[PDB]
Ligand binder design. Structure first.
Ligand code: 6C6
Ligand code: 6C6
Lengths: 130, 125
């Protein structure tokens, strides 16, 4: 089973520690294809990621930090019909993009509010139901 | 003929005045098309499917602008991305790496140059 994890890089690395926790937890549920997010130029990066996205069985995104790449990955993922879980922290004090919040089906595309400490329990809840 | 314009909102409205200028200039080249959030998403995707060209100002990081570009690429839309390196920011590798120089172009520009960059692209067309 393949999992594609999305999180901000050039959008900012403020949530890196949280990304590492998410990736560690995701390894219980499959192979994390994009593990370097939590640590040939741009063309290669893009194509390598697109190939991984096509292979992935599920896409998990932490969407608290605004990022073009995370948004782009989610857009491509929806077009591929992938099951998507977005995780957002309201305590950040920001309001989540209407385009992400509004993409929610509440089934194939889920957007869940969580508190920083609960990330592991949220992922367990999703992958128990998956 | 019809144009979808993308720019950061909840990502930050720092460049809002610039966006307005982009939109004014786009009017010469086509019709600019652009629960609560569910409706906004549905409306925008409808416009995106109808669009003949997609233009995005990608200087301010934004999930929504990224998502629009992802959806637009999957639909094979011609895409122009405009980026300001004098902002001090480095552009997303996923956006820059998506470019192919034809159906997906990324153009670096300086403050005051945006209209001429638009004129060139739409004169291609
Ligand atoms: O850099 P932004 O915040 O626009 O996008 C981050 C998202 O887009 C993908 N991404 C962005 N830059 C990446 C990247 N960059 C290289 C590794 C560090 C410097 C260049 N490598 C792999 N994936 C990348 C990641 O999977 C991540 O989820
Ligand atoms: O809000 P972010 O920065 O994630 O995304 C902005 C992009 O996504 C679309 N968008 C986001 N919020 C929108 C919106 N209303 C939101 C609901 C209250 C104000 C913002 N109305 C129309 N389009 C919107 C725009 O076309 C814009 O290009």
């Amino acid at each position: 089973r393949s999992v594609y994890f999305c999180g901000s890089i050039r959008g900012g690395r403020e949530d890196q520690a949280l990304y590492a926790r998410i990736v560690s937890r995701l390894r219980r549920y499959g192979k994390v294809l994009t593990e370097h997010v939590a640590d040939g130029g741009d063309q290669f990066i893009h194509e390598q990621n697109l190939n991984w996205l096509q292979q992935a069985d599920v896409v998990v995104a932490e969407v608290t930090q605004p990022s073009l790449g995370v948004g782009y990955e989610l857009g491509r993922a929806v077009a591929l019909g992938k099951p998507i879980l977005c995780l957002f922290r309201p305590q950040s004090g920001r309001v989540l993009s209407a385009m992400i919040r509004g993409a929610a089906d509440g089934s194939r595309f889920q957007v869940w509010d969580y508190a920083e400490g609960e990330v592991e329990t949220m992922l367990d809840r999703y992958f128990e139901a998956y």
